[PDB]
């Protein structure tokens, strides 16, 4: 029925963010106005913040398009709304073609309006926080009641969409959200799990951890806030690599944006995901220093550290 709802959970048990992602996926969007926090109109000074958008929750995929033509801008990638259960809601954009990431606190998502906070420009070219208002260009009118409503059809179409992800090294659980599998919280929102990288292997299962040590962390995920942080496995100290994460696309990738000492985004294909192990794949090294595909295995952490998030 709803392929994004792994485990067929009633809505009341789901994160706010995944429900918001689904809401965003129902409509074509276009940037219409930009305002400062007081409500003063700065649309003319921030035209570059305004585009047309299509979102797909199931694949956690977005693309931007020209408002005039609907032609792609060539910017596509991963998006998600943060979980929003124990922390505030933010839109995360990880561009897979334009090599940037953005984190935009939610201001409004209701009916035909989607507004978030972004850095923009005031009348004098000074950098200021602005609110970027998007309006739906498809769907209902949202006026008076209609027994027989005349809804605007959708028109945007993705150029490519999310690629098919088929790399597998072990069982991949598809009956619970991957955020729950790696970032389980208790009823009151307290994260319950810690993981560590155990080894890095090549496609034949040979251990190449020696050549890929910096991929090994003590990792902490929280499904209720979408927060992650990576710590030095041996010292328990933060690596300065922390921000927001999402397991998406029928649990076939883990994506994250680092907002710490090195600004980057990652979209990593998951090849195993279960309560005993998760594995992602990316390019790494062999011991001769050649560039090879590697697989970074993780298991539940058995050590004594229990680090708090540093942000």
Write the layout of secondary structure elements.
Layout (H helix, E strand, L loop, with lengths): L15 H9 L4 E7 L16 E5 L4 E5 L6 E10 L8 E6 L5 E10 L2 E9 L5 E10 L41 H6 L11 E7 L16 E5 L4 E5 L6 E11 L4 E6 L5 E11 L2 E9 L5 E10 L11
Antiparallel strand pairs: 1-2, 1-8, 2-3, 3-4, 4-5, 5-6, 6-7, 7-8, 9-10, 9-16, 10-11, 11-12, 12-13, 13-14, 14-15, 15-16
Q: Helix amount, in percent?
A: under 10%
| SSE arrangement, N to C | HEEEEEEEEHEEEEEEEE
Q: Summarize the main sheet.
A: 8 strands, antiparallel, barrel
Overall 3D geometry? globular
How many structural domains?
A: 2
Supply Rg: 21 Å
Total strands: 16
Q: Which fold name is given in CATH as the topology of the largest domain?
A: Lipocalin
Oligomeric status: monomer
Number of helices: 2
Instruction: Report the structural category.
Output: mainly beta
CATH superfamily of the largest domain: Domain of unknown function DUF4822
The CATH class of the largest domain is Mainly Beta
Work out the strand percent: 35-45%
The second-level CATH architecture of the largest domain is Beta Barrel
Query: In whole angstroms, how far apart are the ends?
Result: 38 Å
In what order do the strands lie side by side in the largest sheet? 1-2-3-4-5-6-7-8
InterPro entries: DUF4822 (IPR032247)
Protein name: DUF4822 domain-containing protein
Pfam families: DUF4822
Organism: Enterococcus faecalis (strain ATCC 700802 / V583)
């Amino acid at each position: 029925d709803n392929p994004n709802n792994l485990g067929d959970l009633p809505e009341y048990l789901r994160s706010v963010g995944i429900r918001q992602d689904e809401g965003l996926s129902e409509k074509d969007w276009a940037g219409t106005r930009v305002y400062d926090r007081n409500g003063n109109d700065l649309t003319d000074e921030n035209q570059n913040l305004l585009h047309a958008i299509k979102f797909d929750a199931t694949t956690s995929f977005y693309e931007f398009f020209d408002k005039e033509t609907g032609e792609s801008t060539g910017d596509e990638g991963t998006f998600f709304m943060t979980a929003g259960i124990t922390d505030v809601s933010r839109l995360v954009i990880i561009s897979e073609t334009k090599n940037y990431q953005g984190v935009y606190p939610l201001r409004t998502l209701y009916q035909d309006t989607f507004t978030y906070r972004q850095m923009g420009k005031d009348k004098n070219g000074n950098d200021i926080e602005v609110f970027v208002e998007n309006k739906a260009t498809s769907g209902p009118v949202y006026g008076r009641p209609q027994p027989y409503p005349n809804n605007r059809p959708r028109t945007l179409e993705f150029t490519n969409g999310r690629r098919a992800m088929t790399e597998q090294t072990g069982q991949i659980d598809v009956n619970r959200q991957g955020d729950e599998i790696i970032g389980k919280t208790s009823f009151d929102g307290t994260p319950q799990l810690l993981w560590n990288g155990t080894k890095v292997v090549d496609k034949d299962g040979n251990d190449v951890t020696s050549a890929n040590q910096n991929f090994i962390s003590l990792a902490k995920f929280d499904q209720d806030s979408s927060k992650y942080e990576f710590f030095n496995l041996q010292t328990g100290e933060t690596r300065g690599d922390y921000g927001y994460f999402k397991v998406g696309n029928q649990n076939k990738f883990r994506a994250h944006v680092s907002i710490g000492t090195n600004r980057y985004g990652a979209v990593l294909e998951l090849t195993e995901l279960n309560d005993n192990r998760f594995t992602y794949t990316r390019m790494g090294k062999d011991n001769e220093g050649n560039d090879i595909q590697v697989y970074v295995e993780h298991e539940p952490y058995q050590g004594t550290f229990n680090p708090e998030f540093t942000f």
